[PDB]
């Protein structure tokens with residue numbers, strides 16, 4: 001009843017151009033089996049959405065990568081939020097919701113916006129820049145590590161570490177094995193910085209530690225939650241912003257509309273998140289035999305959710321392969337959905353918004369003017385290099 005496919009969604013050939021394979025995956029059926037990795041797969045919006053919102057059946061505590069924590073040792077101590085199910089999940093999540101709260105963004109918006117503006121003005125002086133290294137990477141590094149309350153020394157370990165985490169959700173392919181075989185320095189740096197003495201008061205980390213007082217988390221839980229932010233909070237935004245600049249680079253009409261109404265800044269980023277889906281895929285593990293899309297999946301089975309595919313499903317979206325900054329993007333799963341839906345989404349959207357706002361106000365044109373290079377990661381989709389010429393407004 002279930003189609004078996006030999007598509008490797010973690011192959012380089014797939015990353016280079018996933019969309020035809022994603023159509024094949026959608027059109028093959030509501031549930032596919034990927035013989036390559038002995039996992040179930042879901043590529044349509046409906047089923048991906050269904051799986052995300054059924055955490056009691058499709059659990060996270062056996063890992064949200066290919067590896068089953070019930071079968072193998074996790075490569076690092078499990079995340080107390082990402083790789084946990086309710087109820088253990090519930091209370092750490094609340095802490096992160098409050099640390100990264102509506103109230104908190106107020107405290108950082110002026111600086112994040114100022115940092116975005118200064119960067120765009122800086123890049124306009126050079127004229128020809130790499131929209132990755134000089135913008136997508138430089139800007140988040142200039143605000144987010146500080147917002148964490150991180151010291152200056154050692155931050156070069158941050159992106160490599162994030163690169164690793166997202167590779168480690170993947171299968172035991174060369175990317176993962178290669179990523180993990182060189183994690184010691186990154187782990188040591190990040191893990192050391194999660195300790196309270198190393199985190200500046202006022203920053204997200206110290207704020208996380210401050211919450212041990214409420215009974216919501218113990219002191220020994222705080223560093224891993226600090227660790228979560230240092231895992232998820234930087235490289236994602238890099239690829240989201242990079243995605244957004246690339247989209248604006250490829251859809252000049254939409255750049256022009258953005259220029260004509262900078263208050264479209266927040267949704268053009270949101271649309272970019274849908275359109276590129278910086279986080280491409282996650283797994284769940286079935287806790288029981290279960291019917292999904294008329295397909296019966298056994299207990300203890302891995303189910304691969306194609307978030308990017310769900311976000312390009314024509315069953316749900318009109319003209320999905322088109323970037324439209326006034327689209328109603330609500331319901332996209334680029335940030336997930338349900339109890340694990342991105343707890344850092346406000347930081348990401350703030351960063352993206354104020355940068356796209358700066359671009360909208362300061363830049364007249366963005367033209368690709370060099371070889372474009374894709375960055376390969378088992379979970380993250382984004383570019384290694386995007387040479388562009390910025391024309392000032």
Ligand code: HEM
Nearest residue numbers: 081082228232233236237240335336340342343344347348
């Ligand atoms: C473009 C930017 C981002 C994208 C596309 C993204 C994507 C996602 C997705 C898909 C999930 C769901 C994971 C799952 O259901 O298994 C998630 C959760 C999470 N995100 Fe992000 N994220 C972004 C930015 C951020 C930021 C800025 C932070 C922190 C400052 C962050 C930290 C986290 C954490 C800790 C979780 C786990 C939440 C939970 O398990 O309840 N992410 N994100």
Ligand SMILES: CNc1ccc(C(=O)O)cc1
Nearest residue numbers: 079082165227228231232
């Ligand atoms: C969805 N992206 C995430 C990656 C890692 C973590 C974590 O370290 O908990 C959380 C979210």
Ligand SMILES: [Cl-]
Nearest residue numbers: 076187190191
């Ligand atoms: Cl670690």
